[PDB]
Amino acid sequence: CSIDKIRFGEQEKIEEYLVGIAEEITKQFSANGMNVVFYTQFISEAKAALYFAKYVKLSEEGLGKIVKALLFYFPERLDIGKRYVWLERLTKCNELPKSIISIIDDFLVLQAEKHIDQNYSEVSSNGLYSRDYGALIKHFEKNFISKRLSEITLCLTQDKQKQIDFLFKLLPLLSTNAKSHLLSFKSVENINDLMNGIRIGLIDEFTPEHEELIIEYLETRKVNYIVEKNDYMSTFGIWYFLEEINNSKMEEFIMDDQYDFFVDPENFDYKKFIPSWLKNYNDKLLGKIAGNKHMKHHVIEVLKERVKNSNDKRYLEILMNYFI
Amino acid sequence: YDYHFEVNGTVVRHKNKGFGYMERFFELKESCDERSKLSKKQYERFNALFNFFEKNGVICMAKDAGTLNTSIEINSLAYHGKYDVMKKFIEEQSVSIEDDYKKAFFLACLGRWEESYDLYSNIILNSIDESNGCVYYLSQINRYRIYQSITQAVTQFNGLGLLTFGRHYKPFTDEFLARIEREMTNFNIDDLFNGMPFEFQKKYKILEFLSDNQFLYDDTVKLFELTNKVRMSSDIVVLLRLYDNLRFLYENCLWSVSFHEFHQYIRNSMSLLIEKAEYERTRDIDELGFSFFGKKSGFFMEYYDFVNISRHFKIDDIKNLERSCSIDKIRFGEQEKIEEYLVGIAEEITKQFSANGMNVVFYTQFISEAKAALYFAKYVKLSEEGLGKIVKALLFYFPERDLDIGKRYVWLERLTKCNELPKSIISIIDDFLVLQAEKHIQNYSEVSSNGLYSRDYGALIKHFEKNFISKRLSEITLCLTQDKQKQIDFLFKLLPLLSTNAKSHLLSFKSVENINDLMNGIRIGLIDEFTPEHEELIIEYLETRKVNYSNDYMSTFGIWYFLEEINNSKMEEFIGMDDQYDFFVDPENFDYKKFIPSWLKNYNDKLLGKIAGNKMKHHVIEVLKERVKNSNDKRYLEILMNYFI
Amino acid sequence: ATHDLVYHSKINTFVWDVEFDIVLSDSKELNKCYFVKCFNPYRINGKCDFAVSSIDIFSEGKRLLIENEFNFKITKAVHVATSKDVTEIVLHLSERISSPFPIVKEVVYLD
Description:
This is part of a larger assembly, with two copies of chain A and one copy of chain C.
Chain A: H1 11-28, H2 36-52, H3 60-73, H4 80-93, H5 98-114, H6 130-140, H7 147-154, H8 161-169, H9 176-183, H10 192-200, H11 208-226, H12 231-241, H13 257-263, H14 283-291, H15 296-309, H16 314-323
Chain C: E1 6-8, E2 13-15, E3 23-24, E4 28-29, E5 33-39, E6 53-59, E7 62-63, E8 78-79, E9 84-85, H1 87-96, E10 103-104, E11 106-109
Parallel strand pairs in C: 2-10, 5-11
Antiparallel strand pairs in C: 1-2, 3-4, 5-6, 6-7, 8-9
């Protein structure tokens, strides 16, 4: 269905209920007392309420309390990615005011402080990490610089690699002096640094050395996994299809079903195409796919079958907006 | 509660705090030397226990589970519906009281409720001692249930019946009804179990539920596990429990198998199972691959599933199941047994109609099962002989009051999808058409519900055989004269089947003069060819409307012109009055601001395809796109996806 | 009286259990008759392609043979439930829709 178009009534009572839920969550996980039996029943209801709260309009103080409870006192066993998904859902109807941005900055500062011991690594099931949080802030305020994080940036040496990587992931939130100091310790070597740079915006245009990095990574993957008898390959195929890269060598690396489907569309076996991929593409990529001629008359058939059989409303919207 | 007996034949320990006797029994069963450390009496008792446990399908413990595959097998003649066999068995003299019990159940299943009640009373009188109290208890229960069913039949046969069924049709006499009411003046079944001897209450505790009004709430509530959307399974558990309930109710000859509660339970269980299977298939296709799973649903359908669906489902329920749980991707299992079951159904229908010994009580039960089975037989591949017998029974001997001509045509068309028409079936349909033609010779007219008549049979024959000629119909129309108008009309409806000489002789009895004659003739008869003079008649009508410048006439000729059934330039002289005519005549210059999308809901497959093939295509696509975006209409989306994409 | 009104959007019709006192064109008068529409998109046809719904007219419970269908004199509408006059609602609903027959009694889906 499309629930967001259903009128919601009695917003203040729902806000009071959610505030009570947040206060109970804070009580049960702050004062060193967690009722082990009651937790099993209560956590499911709390998670469902916080998930469903995206359609309700909330005031400033209630939203602040809910965000604080969700970010800080919610048990980890909700990972970071699920927490980000919940927060993004919350922000849709109740566009981020300044206080919630301050709370998010506090959470990011706490996470950065946690990144000292060289055994602490974020474990996100979906794949969304703390870095995305920063992007969310930059999605609502372009001129925001975290004053507290700059202090951590300045007092950093080359010894602690984890802090360097973590602050590199959140580069745009830092000030000019902070960026200048941080760039003196890190380069664009290898693959993860290149991906973080292109995502953040350091590398506006790809350079040949990054092409060599990509080529050698593909060679290693070929000789290590398939020859010897994952999202990186899909991202590289996406980059090539968007004409961002200008090399024909990668065409010889045909394996990843998505890789085959992208670099070699004419000879790709469309029987291996799955429709779920179509839910992970943005507007420009979908338009470019619609512009192609070797891909239209099979994607359109897959979409027709999905509309006829499935109960999902995204496929029909995709078909009507772009391919027709 | 010392053990849990799972539906797959395994036993686990639940609350046994003492000695594990069942484990020791299984150990004795597996070994042979350990079996022999018992006395003769204990040895024969162990043999009897082993036979009973093997008969009831208890295999081993959970730890020692090996190659666990379960298949059901019901050994009752009443379930398979071998009516003649039970009729013969009733006649033979009984030996014991169990044979009398079985005869009473068979009589009840055959609609002879008075005889069954009398036999149950006789069994009650004879069997009161001393260890067979189970027979006495079951006889009491069955007698009460038959009394209830007789009262309800009386209730829905004094009213909502009589001539509306065909005749007053008093099922039973009034003396029998008075005696029935007197004998059960204040009978109470709730205290029936508590009045039995205490040894019966201690031993046969498990039968107590038979004395309750409802006994299937546990399974109906448990059916909720098939609606979970969270990614042995519940499907197997539910199916095996259903088979267990059916086998227990049918093998012990209990009359509760004919009440509404049991039918509703069966319907809910089967519908939910098929819904879950289809949803799982869709999810797997969505995530895993387009065809990696194979697109074949995992719900294998066997003989018993077909029998249950035929017996316990109405037509509307089967229609809902087809709509929501697409069946063409569900493959059926054993086909020979299903074909034999359908052949038996057809033979029973033939016997019931021909012998004129219609049993009004048995008719209501049997006809629904027959209709459901013949409706559901579309997905089963049938051999030539079985198909011929089924078609004969359906077309000729099926009562008219329950299947009019249109529904019969619908059933027949369904039966031809997976089998196609061989020569014998065409001969049978030709014989049926000849019989109908003879019947039309009068104060007679066909009555149909869906609006389909005898013309459609000839249309289907021509669809499957372009070069078929009905010799008997040709002989019938060769002797025809001008006195009997309805026969000429009927033969007109079957015009293409007749021979050329018969056609020429038939044309003499009707000719067209005015535009009404032309439209009527093409409407019901066949004037497929558009002669120039008929065209001139249409031109005269159009000129009359032009100078004169409200139902539909002009759009028909516009569509005919667009389909190239008429070829002339005069049509361009009649542009301006009816917008649909202008759209169908002049598409390039048509003002699409006057176009309304509802027109697209009145065209068939061929016209829509021809429109899609004409370039007009882009404006129609834009209109359909806007209509789909504004209001989520399924018909518009279906048309746009099927024809314009 | 409006509670039992149903709208069928697959053929753009209305299901309402009413009786029509239609007056056929050229002074022919008909008593309380009604209509029945059937929806069949798979019927085998020849040159009469312009159809997915077949409309039958039932008068006094018997099918009326059609010779020239031009009745446009409306009808004194009678709700057979308790004999209500609903003619104005009928005439409004008819002008609101471009379909030939806007109101029927029963629709049969042969899909």
